[PDB]
Design a protein around this ligand. Structure first.
Ligand SMILES: [Mn+2]
Ligand SMILES: [Mn+2]
Ligand SMILES: [Mn+2]
Length: 518
């Protein structure tokens, strides 16, 4: 703690020079004649004119529910933590305001260090061979602020791993490079991990508008879509939770099948013991789901802490497919579904190093993905593959044509009727738990009686029954879909009408999933 430590400046007055002036020249108010789209382009998604005009010691509103402030933490018994902030070409104002925010709002007793990881930035203000603005300014901050560099941009996993391997505290908390904290953001995480070292605890994320920089209030539980990305519990999925967990208290810690932002705190030893990150994940993407799956299956738990809140400025290669293939290692027989949803790709997912993580999985004794679905994410639409009874073409023999979803990538999300070619654009799947008829390449798109695709919702407005006669019956209206006239229209159900009889391939996937060759 430097000179001037008090409430709102727990590490002292930051960024002040020997003569007493701040070490950072704040910009004047943004021009009155400033076009936002250009300003956002110049700022890489941020309003830099405004950010550069705001103070690094910026007050933020307490986003915590009032009840969170009725809690006490004994800082002498909590374990120290190491805050890690990775950044690639983060502008000075947002990076240092993130640092100031943490230092000002984190007691020195529980903050071992603050590690800034430069993941190969190229801006002149950061470079080793640049103008030295950043390094010079760090000299005006507590010595517990460190800077470490990657000479080449590694990506999410590589840069975080370097920061984690460099942290000395028993707990590390990973943040973003464009954040502001609510008060007492860290104390909840430390207390929860001290009581059980196997818990990875995520703060809840509020928002900072990228144009106005207004502070905005942010759920908790996250599922995943078969496109292999996290997705919040929809209304119909929280309705499947036990009644005690549907509407949880704001102070309650709540479990989550999946992580999103990448902001979390963990016991360093347990993190490495449970696999850390798969350091073959390239650039960015999906490392949060592989972590979430592996964590739960190998003895960990993932929790969200609503009394721990961080503001996040939301913005306005061939590695992405690889990252998904490697994540499918942890999905056992369900990878067949995931693999078909992302287009049956055949990439070089680096099989040699993935065998090693498979051998690691057994040696550790991790549980199965079926166990994960039945015990961690039983509210999902697909808990067993038996929940997807049809996958293939929806074909009307009478006219000799198939349902064509190629238009889901067109403004008019109209489903069509075309000669069958067997490609993915003519392949549909059925989720029986919700009656959804979707194309295999998007489980967020659902067939409507309008003959159009729209965003799936777990309601009666998307429920279809596939009858034993072959009819697609919209349950709400009890009408059936007909291909009469090469047009999609709803009609009275009548199993003698061949224009409303469809064939749909049953989905009987193998007991285990074999990876495609390279
Ligand atoms: Mn971010
Ligand atoms: Mn949704
Ligand atoms: Mn549409």
């Amino acid at each position: 703690v430097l000179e001037g430590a008090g409430p709102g400046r727990l590490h002292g007055r930051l960024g002040i020079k020997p003569d007493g002036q701040p070490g950072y020249t704040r910009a004047p108010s943004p021009p009155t004649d400033l076009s936002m789209p250009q300003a956002l382009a110049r700022g890489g998604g941020f309003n830099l004119y405004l950010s550069d005009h705001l103070e690094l010691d910026r007050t933020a509103p307490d986003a915590r529910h009032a009840s969170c402030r009725q809690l006490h933490y004994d800082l002498s018994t909590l374990p120290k933590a190491s805050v890690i902030i990775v950044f690639y070409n983060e502008p000075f104002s947002t990076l240092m305001r993130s640092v100031h925010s943490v230092l000002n709002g984190t007691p020195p007793q529980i903050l071992e260090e603050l590690i800034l990881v430069d993941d190969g930035s190229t801006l002149p203000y950061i470079r080793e061979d640049g103008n030295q603005q950043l390094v010079e300014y760090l000299k005006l901050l507590p010595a517990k602020v460190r800077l470490i560099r990657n000479e080449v941009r590694k990506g999410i996993v590589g840069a975080r791993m370097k920061g984690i391997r460099a942290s000395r505290a028993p707990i590390f908390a990973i943040l973003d490079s464009h954040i502001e904290v609510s008060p007492q953001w860290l104390e909840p995480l430390l207390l929860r991990i001290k009581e059980d070292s196997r818990r990875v605890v995520m703060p809840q994320i509020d928002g900072i508008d990228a144009e106005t920089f207004k502070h905005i209030a942010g759920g908790c539980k996250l599922g995943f879509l078969w496109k292999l990305m996290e997705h919040s519990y929809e209304g119909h999925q929280t309705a499947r939770l036990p009644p005690e967990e549907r509407q949880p208290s704001p102070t309650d810690f709540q479990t989550s099948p999946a992580m999103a932002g990448g902001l979390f705190a963990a016991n360093k030893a347990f993190f490495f013991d449970v696999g850390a990150y798969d350091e073959d994940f390239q650039f960015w993407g999906t490392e949060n789901l592989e972590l979430s799956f592996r964590l739960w299956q190998c003895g960990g738990v993932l929790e969200c802490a609503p009394c721990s809140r961080v503001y996040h400025i939301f913005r306005k290669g061939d590695s992405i497919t690889i990252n998904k293939m490697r994540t499918m290692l942890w999905m056992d027989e369900y990878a067949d579904l995931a693999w078909r949803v992302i287009g049956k790709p055949r990439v070089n997912y680096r099989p040699e190093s993935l065998e090693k993580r498979r051998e690691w999985r057994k040696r550790k004794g991790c549980k199965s993905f079926r166990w994960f679905m039945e015990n961690v994410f039983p509210e999902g639409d697909v808990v067993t593959l038996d929940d997807v009874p049809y996958l293939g073409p929806l074909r009307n023999d009478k006219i000799g044509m198939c349902l064509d979803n190629m238009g889901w990538a067109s403004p008019g999300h109209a489903v069509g009727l075309e000669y069958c070619h067997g490609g993915d654009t003519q392949t549909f799947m059925f989720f029986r738990k919700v009656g959804h008829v979707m194309p295999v390449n998007d489980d967020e798109a659902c067939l409507q009686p309008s003959g159009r695709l729209d965003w799936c919702r777990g309601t009666a407005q998307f429920w279809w029954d596939f009858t034993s006669s072959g009819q697609l019956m919209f349950r709400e209206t009890k009408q059936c879909l007909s291909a009469f006239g090469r047009k999609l229209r709803m009609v009275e159900c009548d199993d003698t009408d061949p224009y409303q009889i469809w064939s749909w391939t049953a989905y009987n996937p193998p007991d285990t999933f074999t990876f495609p060759s390279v």
